[PDB]
Amino acid sequence: VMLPDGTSAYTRDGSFQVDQNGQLVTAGGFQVQPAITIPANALSITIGRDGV
Amino acid sequence: VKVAGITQDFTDGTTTNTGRGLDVAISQNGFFRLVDSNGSVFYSRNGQFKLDENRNLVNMQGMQLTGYPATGTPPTIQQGANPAPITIPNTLMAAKSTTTASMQINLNSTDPVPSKTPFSVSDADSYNKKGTVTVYDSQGNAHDMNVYFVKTKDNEWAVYTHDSSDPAATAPTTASTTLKFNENGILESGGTVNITTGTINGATAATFSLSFLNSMQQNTGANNIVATNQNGYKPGDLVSYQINNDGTVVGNYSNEQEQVLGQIVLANFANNEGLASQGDNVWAATQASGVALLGTAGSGNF
Amino acid sequence: YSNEQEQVLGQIVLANFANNEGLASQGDNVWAATQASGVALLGTAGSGNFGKLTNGALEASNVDLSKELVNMIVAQRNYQSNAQTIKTQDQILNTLVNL
Amino acid sequence: GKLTNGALEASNVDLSKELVNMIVAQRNYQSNAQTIKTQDQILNTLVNL
Amino acid sequence: GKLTNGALEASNVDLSKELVNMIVAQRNYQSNAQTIKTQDQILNTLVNL
Amino acid sequence: SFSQAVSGLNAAATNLDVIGNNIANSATYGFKSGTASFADMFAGSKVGLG
Amino acid sequence: VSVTQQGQAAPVQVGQLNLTTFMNDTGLESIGENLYIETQSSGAPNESTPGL
C-alpha cells in the first residue's frame, strides 16, 4: 500500500473499495501499489487464484 | 480499536410482483434521481411512485421525480437536455391537420378499359376503383376524401379527387392525377399529389400531399388496398397513463394517440458505498462518489 | 308509468380524482376529499375518464385470503425477531449493571 | 298485483346457492381464527420476554 | 309480550363470543402480574444496596 | 439502545394490524385492500435510528 | 401549521412556525424547565424557516 507521504506499508486485511477516480483503494483512502484502476461502466469484478 | 466507518452492501434485492401501475424496479445498478423543494438533488431506489395535486410523479414521502423533459410538436424525448421534473398534464390536446397521406393500391393489369367513355360520379362502372380517405382539419372535422381510379389505356391510370363531407364540393370531371407504371408494373414517377379539401364551418381547408408510392399494377385478380395512413388526429382527453420498460410515460387518449411525457433518467455512480444517507431511503452525492454520470435505462450498463 | 310514458329523474354523477391514495378513510365505506387528492371533478359515466356501470350487480372486496395469510406468517416472524433484539439489549445492559 | 285462488308462493330460496356459500362462510370463519391464534402467540412471547 | 304454549327459551349465551373473551382476559391478567414482578425486582435491587 | 428495537415493534405491529384488517374486511362489497409502507431514518451518519 | 375544519373543505393556513439557529449552540446558558437564554458567547440568533 502506498502511504500518502510517499513510503510503502504492508497490510494483511483485505477489504477494498473504489475511490471517486476509479482506483482500487483500501478502507481509509490508501491506494494499492500496483495501482489497479477499475474502469467505469463495470458490471462485475472477478479475481482468480492468481493476482489477475 | 477504532471504528473505521460503516459500509452498505449494494447487491440487488429480490423483485416482488406487487401489481399496480406506478411501481418500478431496477434489475441492475442504477439510482432514481430525486429533488427537494430547496432544489438539492437526491438519489434513491424506491419504486413507489404517486401523483399529487400538481399531477407530478412524486415518491411516497413528497420528493419530486426528475427526468428528461419532452418538448416539441410533436413532443419527443431529448437525451441532451438537463434533468427536469416529470409531469403528466391533464390538459386536452388540440387537433392537428393531416399533412402527409400515403396509400398503397394494387391494380389489375388484366382490367379492361371501362365501357363508358364519359366519366360519371353517379355510376360505379365509370371508375375502376373507389378510395375513401379520412382527413382531419385544424378544427377536428372529418373530410371523407374519395379517390377514384380510372384506367383509360394500357399501363395508364387516371386518379381523381372528390370530397363527400363538403356539401358545396364540385363533382370532378377532369383528370387530377396521371399514373404510369414501369414495364413490370413498378411505379416510376407522378406519385406525389397535392390535395386540398373544402372549408366547412368557417375552418380553413386541409392541405396535404397525397402519395401513391409503393403501388403496383401487376395482375392480382381484383383491386385491393393494402395500406392507408394519415397524420391527423381529433382533440382527445386524458384517460390512462402507462410506464414502459424504457422509462417513458405514455398517456392514452380517445383517438388512440400516444403522447410521450418524458422518460426516467438513471444515475450510476463511479463508486458505491460513498453515498451519505439523508433521512428516508434516499442518498445525496458527495465526495468518494464521483459525478452523477446520468444516462438512459436502455444501455450504458444502467 | 301506467300510460306507456317514460320519465327521467336525473343521472347519477361519478367522481374522479386527479390523484388517488389521498382519500382519507371516514368510518364506513366512504371517502372524503382533502389535500393531495385533487378536486372532486364531477363527470358523467357516458365516455371519457369514467367507466360503464352495470344494473343489478356489485363488485367484490378485491381481498384474497391466500395472499393475506402468507403475509401474516412473514409479519409474525419479523416481530419475534425484533423481540430478540430488545431482549438481548436488556441482558447486555444487565451484565454491565452488576459487573 | 293480481291474486290467484288455489295457489301459494314458494320459499324463493336456492339450495345450490346456499350450499356453496356455506363452504365459503366456514373458511372465512376459520381464517379469522388464525389471526386470533397469531395474536395469542405474538403476545405470549412478549409477556414472557 | 305474547306467550307460547309448549316451548322453552335457551340461555342466549354464545360460546364463540365467550371463548374469545377468555383469551384476551387471560393475557390482561398476565400483563398485570408483570407489574408486580417488576415492582418486586425494582424493590429487591434497592434493599440489597 | 432500545430506540431501534422499539421502533421495529411499532412497524411490525402496524403491519399485522393492517393485515388483520384486510382479512376481516373480506366480503365487504365497497372495500379496497390496504398495505403499509415503511421508510428507514438516519439522523446523523454511520448508524441507523429505526 | 394548518387546521382541518368541519365546513371549509380545505385546511386553513393558521400561521408560520420558524426556528432560530445559533453558530455557538454549546455556548448557550441553560436555565430550568428546558429553556436556553441567549448570552454573549452564543451569537445573535437568525430566525429562519425549516429547511433553509
XYZ file of C-alpha atoms in Angstrom:
653
model
C 0.000 0.000 0.000
C 1.282 3.463 -0.931
C 1.072 5.746 2.096
C 0.124 9.405 1.491
C 3.554 10.743 2.477
C 5.243 8.600 -0.167
C 6.514 5.459 1.545
C 5.056 1.945 1.308
C 3.311 -0.020 4.056
C 2.063 -3.599 4.081
C -1.320 -4.917 5.182
C -2.944 -8.296 5.740
C -6.654 -7.456 5.990
C -8.232 -7.380 2.549
C -11.399 -5.298 2.222
C -11.089 -2.931 -0.722
C -13.270 -0.201 -2.192
C -13.092 2.231 -5.111
C -12.253 5.918 -4.906
C -14.113 8.602 -6.841
C -11.423 8.473 -9.549
C -11.607 4.715 -10.150
C -8.531 3.419 -8.303
C -8.755 0.302 -6.143
C -8.106 1.527 -2.596
C -8.456 0.068 0.871
C -10.761 1.487 3.538
C -9.098 4.675 4.742
C -8.150 6.206 1.410
C -4.917 4.256 0.862
C -4.247 3.008 -2.659
C -2.610 -0.230 -3.777
C 0.970 -0.073 -5.035
C 0.392 -1.696 -8.477
C -2.388 0.926 -8.844
C -5.165 -1.238 -10.258
C -7.609 1.159 -11.929
C -11.176 -0.152 -12.025
C -12.829 1.451 -15.077
C -16.308 2.923 -15.050
C -19.391 1.241 -16.561
C -18.349 -2.019 -14.913
C -20.728 -4.930 -14.364
C -18.621 -7.089 -12.040
C -15.053 -7.703 -10.888
C -13.570 -11.208 -10.910
C -10.353 -12.316 -9.201
C -8.907 -15.804 -9.597
C -6.422 -17.735 -7.510
C -3.649 -15.744 -9.168
C -3.465 -11.979 -8.914
C -5.185 -11.369 -12.249
C -9.871 -0.463 18.321
C -11.364 2.373 16.283
C -14.472 2.140 14.122
C -13.273 2.633 10.540
C -16.592 3.685 9.011
C -19.565 1.525 8.079
C -20.425 0.326 4.584
C -23.609 -0.825 2.866
C -23.908 -3.867 0.621
C -25.487 -2.757 -2.663
C -26.326 -6.188 -4.073
C -29.665 -6.307 -5.853
C -32.686 -7.490 -3.891
C -35.497 -9.781 -4.966
C -38.237 -8.317 -7.148
C -41.826 -8.831 -5.997
C -44.908 -8.637 -8.228
C -46.764 -6.030 -6.200
C -49.035 -5.095 -9.090
C -50.315 -1.537 -9.571
C -49.128 0.716 -12.379
C -46.896 3.256 -10.643
C -44.150 0.991 -9.347
C -40.853 0.070 -10.999
C -37.773 -1.937 -10.084
C -34.181 -1.890 -11.324
C -32.606 -5.259 -12.099
C -29.019 -3.932 -12.103
C -27.051 -0.963 -10.796
C -28.883 2.346 -11.041
C -30.489 5.027 -8.875
C -33.534 7.197 -9.469
C -32.951 10.950 -9.383
C -34.964 12.967 -6.856
C -35.065 16.639 -5.886
C -36.464 18.502 -2.898
C -38.281 21.824 -2.751
C -34.961 23.532 -1.966
C -33.508 22.331 -5.285
C -30.960 19.852 -3.930
C -30.719 16.553 -5.808
C -31.106 13.175 -4.100
C -30.746 9.591 -5.305
C -32.798 6.601 -4.176
C -34.150 3.211 -5.259
C -37.788 3.362 -4.118
C -40.173 2.090 -6.760
C -43.247 3.549 -5.059
C -44.487 6.481 -7.142
C -47.672 8.509 -6.819
C -49.177 11.652 -8.259
C -50.127 14.720 -6.236
C -52.449 17.700 -6.555
C -49.990 19.151 -9.091
C -50.043 15.976 -11.247
C -46.341 15.239 -10.728
C -44.580 11.913 -10.234
C -43.651 12.022 -6.545
C -42.260 9.438 -4.155
C -44.294 8.293 -1.165
C -42.656 10.893 1.110
C -43.001 14.017 -1.038
C -39.938 14.373 -3.277
C -40.477 15.085 -6.964
C -39.085 12.745 -9.607
C -36.815 14.214 -12.280
C -36.129 13.048 -15.807
C -35.593 14.007 -19.412
C -38.152 16.647 -20.452
C -40.329 16.077 -23.509
C -40.559 19.099 -25.808
C -41.601 19.844 -29.371
C -44.559 19.429 -31.706
C -44.982 16.518 -31.676
C -43.267 16.154 -28.292
C -40.262 13.846 -28.228
C -37.651 12.735 -25.725
C -34.341 14.606 -25.579
C -31.131 12.992 -24.339
C -29.215 16.282 -24.440
C -31.476 18.187 -22.062
C -30.901 18.724 -18.360
C -32.995 16.671 -15.909
C -36.410 18.163 -15.196
C -39.402 17.134 -13.068
C -41.705 14.681 -14.824
C -45.368 15.680 -15.006
C -48.488 14.113 -16.507
C -50.669 17.065 -17.576
C -54.448 16.809 -17.679
C -54.833 19.484 -20.370
C -56.590 18.390 -23.554
C -54.609 18.392 -26.794
C -55.792 20.196 -29.916
C -56.401 18.716 -33.350
C -53.597 18.588 -35.916
C -54.396 18.810 -39.621
C -53.424 15.905 -41.851
C -50.367 16.837 -43.918
C -48.937 13.589 -45.348
C -51.329 10.867 -46.509
C -49.952 7.801 -48.283
C -51.773 4.728 -49.577
C -50.770 1.542 -51.383
C -53.099 0.260 -54.113
C -52.637 -2.984 -56.048
C -54.174 -2.756 -59.521
C -55.037 -5.321 -62.188
C -53.158 -5.355 -65.487
C -55.913 -7.564 -66.952
C -58.501 -4.855 -66.215
C -60.148 -3.739 -69.481
C -60.943 -0.085 -70.087
C -64.432 0.796 -68.768
C -67.096 0.848 -71.466
C -68.488 4.303 -70.643
C -66.194 6.902 -72.205
C -67.513 9.974 -70.296
C -66.665 9.985 -66.601
C -69.565 9.718 -64.159
C -69.687 10.155 -60.395
C -73.187 8.627 -60.061
C -72.271 5.373 -61.854
C -69.856 2.801 -60.449
C -68.699 1.478 -63.834
C -67.333 4.924 -64.742
C -64.416 4.442 -62.315
C -62.347 1.300 -61.850
C -61.861 1.710 -58.091
C -63.101 3.905 -55.243
C -60.860 5.123 -52.408
C -62.188 6.785 -49.207
C -59.506 8.671 -47.157
C -60.327 10.369 -43.832
C -58.531 13.714 -43.456
C -58.673 15.941 -40.373
C -58.512 19.738 -40.388
C -57.308 22.160 -37.701
C -60.769 22.113 -36.082
C -61.376 18.356 -35.996
C -63.805 17.918 -38.873
C -63.505 14.695 -40.865
C -63.008 15.090 -44.621
C -64.222 11.976 -46.451
C -61.804 12.273 -49.365
C -62.726 9.904 -52.201
C -60.049 8.960 -54.741
C -61.207 7.295 -57.957
C -59.036 5.091 -60.164
C -59.863 5.124 -63.881
C -57.890 3.188 -66.499
C -58.042 4.880 -69.907
C -55.417 2.955 -71.904
C -52.679 0.360 -71.466
C -50.453 0.892 -68.407
C -52.197 4.185 -67.635
C -54.468 5.118 -64.727
C -56.437 8.317 -64.119
C -56.683 9.367 -60.465
C -59.328 11.904 -59.450
C -60.064 13.810 -56.240
C -63.526 14.038 -54.687
C -64.840 15.019 -51.254
C -68.090 13.774 -49.717
C -68.174 15.669 -46.402
C -68.437 19.020 -48.218
C -71.980 19.758 -49.471
C -70.518 22.554 -51.626
C -67.861 20.327 -53.217
C -67.817 20.248 -57.012
C -68.067 16.904 -58.787
C -64.728 16.193 -60.510
C -64.770 15.631 -64.255
C -61.210 16.414 -65.353
C -58.046 14.414 -64.717
C -56.348 15.300 -61.427
C -53.544 12.716 -61.486
C -51.932 10.501 -64.124
C -50.128 7.323 -63.043
C -47.755 5.466 -65.371
C -46.062 2.276 -64.204
C -42.864 0.671 -65.476
C -42.610 -2.297 -67.849
C -43.098 -4.669 -64.891
C -45.747 -2.567 -63.139
C -43.283 -0.835 -60.808
C -44.226 2.759 -60.046
C -41.793 5.268 -61.550
C -42.963 8.863 -61.015
C -46.018 11.051 -60.557
C -46.979 9.501 -57.216
C -46.962 12.753 -55.208
C -50.183 14.780 -55.437
C -51.235 17.940 -53.586
C -54.865 17.521 -52.484
C -56.793 20.262 -50.670
C -60.179 19.676 -49.042
C -63.102 22.109 -48.830
C -63.717 24.535 -45.985
C -66.591 23.765 -43.606
C -67.898 25.592 -40.517
C -65.569 28.526 -41.162
C -62.438 26.387 -40.779
C -59.608 26.520 -43.302
C -59.397 23.546 -45.641
C -56.867 20.767 -45.099
C -53.860 20.910 -47.436
C -51.846 17.696 -47.700
C -49.634 15.795 -50.134
C -51.126 12.514 -51.361
C -48.724 9.643 -52.041
C -49.399 6.529 -54.131
C -45.826 5.283 -53.685
C -45.056 1.552 -53.476
C -48.012 0.590 -55.671
C -48.024 -1.959 -58.488
C -50.498 -2.667 -61.288
C -49.430 -6.298 -61.759
C -52.326 -8.742 -62.067
C -53.646 -9.684 -58.616
C -57.194 -10.577 -59.679
C -59.080 -7.730 -58.005
C -58.151 -4.256 -56.812
C -57.172 -4.290 -53.141
C -55.957 -1.512 -50.851
C -53.222 -2.921 -48.617
C -52.291 0.237 -46.679
C -53.763 3.602 -45.713
C -52.160 6.098 -43.344
C -52.581 9.720 -42.307
C -51.115 12.166 -39.793
C -54.192 13.906 -38.401
C -55.976 13.425 -35.105
C -59.006 14.982 -33.435
C -58.660 16.514 -29.951
C -58.507 13.943 -27.170
C -58.849 13.661 -23.413
C -56.634 12.160 -20.730
C -57.667 8.582 -19.962
C -54.813 6.455 -18.633
C -51.035 6.542 -18.279
C -48.613 3.643 -18.577
C -44.893 3.196 -17.914
C -42.979 1.039 -20.381
C -39.705 -0.828 -19.880
C -37.796 2.137 -21.358
C -38.971 4.537 -18.641
C -41.168 6.576 -20.983
C -44.554 7.723 -19.699
C -47.234 7.354 -22.381
C -50.771 8.668 -21.944
C -53.626 7.179 -23.949
C -56.393 9.371 -25.351
C -59.704 8.990 -27.185
C -58.156 8.865 -30.675
C -55.525 6.275 -29.643
C -52.747 8.876 -29.804
C -49.568 8.221 -27.827
C -48.073 11.271 -26.105
C -44.607 10.876 -24.582
C -44.280 12.967 -21.416
C -40.637 12.077 -20.717
C -38.524 9.149 -19.628
C -36.918 8.260 -16.313
C -33.216 9.052 -16.013
C -30.916 6.643 -14.186
C -27.765 7.871 -12.447
C -24.905 5.435 -11.863
C -22.050 6.418 -9.562
C -18.424 5.586 -10.308
C -18.210 4.157 -6.778
C -20.948 2.981 -4.428
C -20.769 2.906 -0.587
C -19.736 6.565 -0.707
C -23.254 7.963 -0.579
C -24.452 9.548 2.664
C -27.980 8.593 3.693
C -30.347 11.518 4.292
C -33.382 10.734 6.426
C -35.625 8.478 4.367
C -34.295 5.939 1.884
C -32.559 8.497 -0.344
C -28.894 9.326 -0.834
C -27.009 12.539 -1.579
C -23.965 12.707 -3.832
C -20.728 13.801 -2.168
C -17.019 13.030 -2.173
C -15.929 9.422 -2.746
C -18.882 9.100 -5.137
C -17.928 10.950 -8.328
C -20.153 12.818 -10.750
C -23.784 11.839 -11.300
C -22.971 10.175 -14.656
C -26.534 10.164 -15.938
C -27.867 8.014 -18.753
C -30.877 6.242 -20.172
C -32.292 2.984 -18.841
C -31.633 1.103 -22.083
C -27.864 0.901 -22.483
C -24.693 2.241 -20.897
C -24.577 -0.536 -18.242
C -27.574 1.050 -16.487
C -95.936 4.834 -15.829
C -99.394 3.341 -16.288
C -99.882 5.077 -19.660
C -96.786 3.986 -21.630
C -94.772 7.033 -20.544
C -91.100 7.223 -19.557
C -89.711 9.997 -17.349
C -86.146 10.757 -16.269
C -85.486 11.957 -12.716
C -81.781 12.696 -13.247
C -78.472 10.974 -13.845
C -76.007 9.622 -11.299
C -72.770 11.590 -11.082
C -69.345 9.956 -10.956
C -66.253 11.283 -9.196
C -62.681 11.020 -10.469
C -59.696 12.419 -8.599
C -56.512 13.713 -10.180
C -54.596 11.736 -7.533
C -55.787 8.680 -5.621
C -54.378 7.406 -2.295
C -55.303 10.756 -0.744
C -58.917 9.909 0.051
C -58.897 9.717 3.843
C -60.974 6.829 5.158
C -64.043 8.013 7.082
C -65.607 5.290 9.204
C -67.996 3.432 6.913
C -67.160 2.680 3.281
C -66.895 6.333 2.214
C -64.029 8.681 1.389
C -63.563 12.407 1.972
C -61.607 14.603 -0.421
C -58.732 16.623 1.019
C -55.287 17.937 0.137
C -53.014 15.833 -2.086
C -56.151 14.288 -3.618
C -57.414 16.873 -6.123
C -60.817 18.453 -6.638
C -63.998 16.386 -6.898
C -64.030 16.771 -10.708
C -67.580 15.591 -11.299
C -68.427 13.942 -14.588
C -70.676 11.524 -16.432
C -70.489 7.767 -16.966
C -71.046 8.209 -20.716
C -67.494 8.418 -22.052
C -64.034 9.648 -21.150
C -62.309 9.055 -17.815
C -65.364 7.307 -16.321
C -66.269 3.682 -16.931
C -69.596 1.995 -17.534
C -71.914 0.736 -14.806
C -73.983 -2.448 -14.627
C -77.561 -2.757 -13.403
C -78.206 -5.342 -10.709
C -74.563 -6.114 -9.968
C -71.919 -5.487 -7.320
C -68.146 -5.734 -7.035
C -66.219 -7.951 -4.635
C -63.794 -6.849 -1.914
C -60.622 -7.357 -4.042
C -59.184 -9.136 -0.977
C -57.826 -12.669 -1.359
C -57.300 -14.707 1.796
C -54.468 -16.676 0.171
C -52.251 -13.601 -0.164
C -53.118 -12.336 3.320
C -52.466 -15.498 5.333
C -48.950 -15.970 3.946
C -48.047 -12.359 4.746
C -49.265 -12.975 8.295
C -46.619 -15.672 8.793
C -43.895 -13.372 7.464
C -45.095 -10.454 9.588
C -45.188 -12.589 12.735
C -41.588 -13.758 12.317
C -40.291 -10.207 11.893
C -41.971 -9.232 15.160
C -40.389 -12.124 17.056
C -37.006 -11.281 15.534
C -37.328 -7.700 16.782
C -38.347 -9.045 20.190
C -34.987 -10.829 20.258
C -33.078 -7.582 19.713
C -34.759 -5.891 22.669
C -34.247 -8.979 24.842
C -30.536 -9.180 24.069
C -30.345 -5.430 24.664
C -31.628 -5.953 28.204
C -29.208 -8.784 29.003
C -26.219 -6.889 27.610
C -27.148 -3.934 29.820
C -27.924 -6.168 32.806
C -24.416 -7.644 32.737
C -22.948 -4.137 32.730
C -25.003 -3.167 35.795
C -23.902 -5.804 38.304
C -20.427 -6.233 36.768
C -100.872 -7.139 -8.433
C -103.453 -9.755 -9.290
C -104.084 -12.708 -6.988
C -104.721 -16.375 -7.768
C -107.014 -18.589 -5.704
C -105.767 -22.113 -5.112
C -102.118 -21.084 -5.454
C -99.337 -20.445 -2.948
C -95.895 -18.870 -3.181
C -92.726 -20.910 -2.692
C -89.894 -20.017 -0.297
C -87.862 -18.257 -3.051
C -84.603 -19.868 -1.948
C -81.896 -21.713 -3.876
C -80.325 -24.758 -2.242
C -77.346 -24.697 -4.615
C -76.519 -21.038 -3.811
C -76.725 -21.659 -0.038
C -74.623 -24.835 -0.060
C -71.699 -23.208 -1.871
C -71.960 -20.090 0.299
C -71.837 -22.400 3.319
C -68.368 -23.633 2.341
C -67.110 -20.090 1.738
C -68.536 -18.891 5.054
C -66.815 -21.660 7.022
C -63.382 -20.950 5.535
C -63.721 -17.251 6.333
C -64.681 -18.175 9.872
C -61.647 -20.402 10.225
C -59.447 -17.806 8.516
C -60.144 -15.189 11.187
C -59.340 -17.787 13.845
C -55.775 -17.834 12.525
C -55.482 -14.129 13.349
C -56.528 -14.805 16.944
C -54.014 -17.649 17.202
C -51.282 -15.436 15.749
C -52.201 -12.620 18.138
C -52.074 -15.103 21.019
C -48.551 -16.315 20.226
C -47.243 -12.845 19.377
C -48.381 -11.586 22.781
C -47.186 -14.678 24.660
C -43.571 -14.135 23.611
C -43.640 -10.504 24.746
C -45.099 -11.113 28.216
C -42.638 -13.932 28.929
C -39.784 -11.848 27.455
C -95.232 -9.799 25.063
C -97.161 -12.806 23.843
C -96.706 -16.233 25.398
C -96.231 -19.600 23.700
C -97.552 -22.990 24.785
C -95.178 -25.933 24.544
C -91.820 -24.200 24.181
C -88.735 -23.124 26.110
C -86.045 -20.484 25.666
C -82.293 -21.035 25.551
C -79.603 -19.270 27.589
C -78.820 -16.617 24.923
C -75.132 -17.301 25.647
C -72.857 -17.596 22.619
C -69.860 -19.867 23.155
C -67.824 -18.228 20.392
C -68.257 -14.772 21.927
C -67.315 -16.011 25.396
C -64.337 -18.175 24.422
C -62.504 -15.378 22.605
C -63.197 -13.020 25.513
C -61.449 -15.505 27.802
C -58.278 -15.395 25.693
C -57.952 -11.615 25.932
C -58.884 -11.715 29.624
C -56.087 -14.178 30.397
C -53.476 -12.008 28.674
C -54.694 -8.977 30.623
C -54.134 -10.824 33.901
C -50.622 -11.900 32.919
C -49.726 -8.328 31.969
C -50.832 -7.150 35.415
C -48.710 -9.835 37.069
C -45.666 -8.445 35.252
C -46.020 -5.115 37.059
C -45.930 -6.912 40.410
C -42.923 -8.897 39.202
C -41.263 -5.674 38.054
C -42.217 -3.913 41.291
C -40.656 -6.754 43.281
C -37.325 -6.728 41.434
C -37.075 -2.933 41.462
C -37.608 -3.025 45.234
C -35.304 -6.025 45.698
C -32.451 -4.200 43.964
C -32.880 -1.142 46.182
C -32.887 -3.012 49.506
C -29.884 -5.172 48.580
C -27.813 -1.998 48.053
C -30.034 1.248 22.596
C -33.725 0.390 22.775
C -34.681 3.145 20.317
C -34.126 0.972 17.247
C -35.706 -2.162 18.724
C -38.751 -0.231 19.961
C -39.310 1.363 16.556
C -39.124 -2.084 14.976
C -42.038 -3.378 17.041
C -44.303 -0.492 16.035
C -43.738 -1.197 12.340
C -44.447 -4.916 12.700
C -47.443 -4.246 14.943
C -48.776 -1.784 12.369
C -48.084 -4.283 9.587
C -50.008 -7.015 11.398
C -52.881 -4.644 12.187
C -53.372 -3.795 8.507
C -53.228 -7.470 7.516
C -55.754 -8.324 10.212
C -57.997 -5.562 8.899
C -57.864 -6.851 5.316
C -58.736 -10.451 6.181
C -61.574 -9.370 8.480
C -62.953 -6.886 5.940
C -63.478 -9.622 3.341
C -66.866 -9.859 1.577
C -67.395 -6.111 2.132
C -68.517 -5.085 -1.343
C -67.296 -1.493 -1.265
C -63.841 -2.227 0.137
C -60.290 -1.724 -1.129
C -57.353 -3.652 0.301
C -54.728 -1.670 2.185
C -50.984 -2.110 2.563
C -48.401 -0.434 4.785
C -45.098 1.079 3.686
C -42.016 1.789 5.794
C -39.005 4.064 5.418
C -35.719 3.970 7.307
C -34.448 7.020 9.183
C -30.919 8.405 9.527
C -30.319 11.321 11.881
C -26.553 11.677 11.581
C -24.441 9.081 9.797
C -22.862 5.624 10.153
C -25.715 4.460 12.438
C -29.413 3.763 11.995
C -32.256 5.012 14.168
C -35.090 2.632 13.299
C -49.414 24.795 10.743
C -52.872 24.093 9.328
C -56.240 23.291 10.887
C -58.770 20.889 9.387
C -62.229 22.353 9.979
C -65.724 20.953 9.579
C -67.233 23.200 6.920
C -64.400 24.649 4.839
C -63.463 21.608 2.680
C -59.788 22.646 2.932
C -57.237 23.370 5.666
C -56.701 26.971 6.743
C -53.114 28.230 6.941
C -53.164 29.491 10.526
C -49.580 30.707 10.641
C -45.880 30.008 10.284
C -43.650 28.259 12.834
C -39.982 29.107 12.277
C -36.984 28.360 14.484
C -33.756 30.077 15.484
C -30.253 28.716 14.927
C -27.034 29.786 16.635
C -23.452 29.314 15.489
C -22.278 28.502 19.048
C -25.023 26.178 20.279
C -22.777 24.838 23.050
C -22.340 28.391 24.345
C -25.966 28.905 25.353
C -26.674 29.486 29.039
C -29.190 26.978 30.378
C -31.912 27.690 32.921
C -34.564 25.439 34.410
C -37.522 23.924 32.570
C -35.567 23.066 29.392
C -35.053 26.696 28.386
C -31.897 28.292 26.994
C -31.348 32.054 27.031
C -29.136 33.975 24.634
C -25.795 35.077 26.076
C -22.651 36.773 24.809
C -20.794 33.547 23.988
C -23.650 32.458 21.740
C -24.092 34.607 18.665
C -27.141 36.634 17.775
C -29.930 34.316 16.571
C -31.155 34.496 12.977
C -34.661 33.043 12.812
C -35.445 31.041 9.684
C -37.986 28.645 8.251
C -37.222 24.911 8.401
C -35.038 23.513 5.644
C -33.132 26.730 4.886
